[PDB]
Design a protein around this motif. Structure first.
Motif, PDB file in Angstrom:
ATOM      1  N   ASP A  38      57.360  95.650  31.749  1.00  0.00           N
ATOM      2  CA  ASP A  38      56.183  94.884  32.440  1.00  0.00           C
ATOM      3  C   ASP A  38      56.691  93.546  33.045  1.00  0.00           C
ATOM      4  O   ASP A  38      56.275  93.322  34.410  1.00  0.00           O
ATOM      5  N   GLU A  63      49.240  90.442  34.228  1.00  0.00           N
ATOM      6  CA  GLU A  63      48.969  91.173  32.959  1.00  0.00           C
ATOM      7  C   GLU A  63      49.597  90.449  31.921  1.00  0.00           C
ATOM      8  O   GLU A  63      49.141  89.925  30.830  1.00  0.00           O
ATOM      9  N   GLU A  64      50.998  90.244  31.798  1.00  0.00           N
ATOM     10  CA  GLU A  64      52.059  89.807  30.675  1.00  0.00           C
ATOM     11  C   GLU A  64      52.355  88.434  31.155  1.00  0.00           C
ATOM     12  O   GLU A  64      52.074  87.872  32.089  1.00  0.00           O
TER      13      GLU A  64
END
Ligand SMILES: [Gd]
Ligand SMILES: [Gd]
Ligand SMILES: [Gd]
Ligand SMILES: [Gd]
Length: 324
Positions: A38, A63-64
């Motif tokens: 990711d 998101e990460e």
């Protein structure tokens, strides 16, 4: 932002290559690797866009975190390049000196891919770079990705589970208003050749800027609802936040409704923009149960609190709201 959108298509297909490799390639398949995969996709998109459009790199959110932890407990800042050798030396710190796996990833990360829609080369739209923010979900539908079902029959065009439900979501939004301007959805796993095991992918782009509404060419073909597999609220079960939004884009589903607070700005932003470009959008479900579009500039933190309804037609929405 046509030249920015054209460049976001390239890196999305580059992201799709990384998504396919980690399932296709057998060293990587054996192998938290998903969180690594990711961040790696998220950092590829972040640097490439910074490279071609200096100043956008610090406006690309995801998101990460760019920081990971290895088995030793060392915290590594994931900065790729500039040469292929430095990425091997960085990934070998995270994967416990696994050279076969480190060389495999780095080769796909530094792989020059040439993916271009000639339809978008014709259009010349300019958007100021200073007013653009980007939300990135590198590989959406984690569960369906790791399991990797390639043998699921779709229920009336809609896959309930399997690798088809995996999508690369890159959204672009106005910093001041919070309205999504551009969005790119990439399905890395659409059609597999059973004999060669090779996956063929499909990308979807959409632009909605100051009343100019353009989107990618969509394939041909009362209400058709698509809900998540855990949704406890003609209805279809379908995995992946991105995919369920794509079902509404492709016309396979008329409405996509998610009640829980477990979807985030990066899950919806890409689809929202594409839906806007076809005269649709996404509304807050709780605010509709008492049309307020989802914003992507202010937090609450970056979760769609009160759920969402994703719609292609504003009439189809009104009918669905009249019944509920
Ligand atoms: Gd251009
Ligand atoms: Gd993740
Ligand atoms: Gd950089
Ligand atoms: Gd997600």
């Amino acid at each position: 932002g046509s030249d920015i959108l054209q460049e976001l298509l390239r890196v999305s297909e580059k992201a799709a290559n990384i998504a396919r490799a980690c399932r296709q390639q057998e060293t990587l398949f054996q192998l938290d690797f998903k969180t690594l995969a990711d961040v790696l996709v998220q950092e590829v998109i972040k640097e490439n866009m910074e490279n071609k459009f200096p100043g956008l790199g610090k406006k690309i959110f995801g998101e990460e975190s760019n920081e990971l932890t290895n088995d030793l407990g060392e915290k590594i800042i994931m900065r790729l390049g500039p040469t292929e050798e430095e990425t091997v030396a960085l990934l070998s710190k995270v994967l416990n000196g696994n050279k076969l796996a480190s060389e495999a990833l780095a080769k796909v990360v530094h792989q020059d891919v040439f993916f271009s829609d000639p339809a978008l080369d014709s259009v010349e739209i300019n958007i100021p770079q200073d007013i653009l923010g980007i939300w990135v979900d590198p590989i959406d539908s984690t569960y369906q990705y790791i399991k990797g079902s390639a043998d699921i029959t779709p229920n009336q065009g809609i896959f309930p589970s399997g690798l088809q439900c995996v999508t690369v979501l890159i959204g672009v939004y106005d910093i001041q208003t919070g309205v999504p301007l551009m969005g790119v959805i990439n399905q890395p796993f659409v059609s597999q050749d059973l004999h060669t095991r090779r996956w063929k992918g499909q990308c979807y782009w959409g632009l909605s800027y100051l009343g100019t509404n353009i989107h990618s060419l969509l394939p041909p073909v009362s209400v058709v609802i698509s809900t998540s597999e855990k949704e406890t609220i003609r209805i279809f079960r379908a995995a992946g936040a991105g995919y369920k939004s794509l079902c509404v884009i492709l016309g396979l589903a008329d409405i996509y409704i998610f009640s829980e607070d477990t979807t985030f700005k990066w899950d919806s932003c890409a689809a929202h923009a594409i839906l806007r470009a076809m005269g649709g959008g996404m509304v807050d479900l709780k605010e509709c149960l008492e049309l307020p579009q989802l914003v992507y500039h202010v937090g609450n933190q970056w979760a769609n609190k009160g759920g969402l309804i994703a719609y292609r037609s504003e009439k189809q929405l009104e009918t669905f709201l009249s019944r509920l």
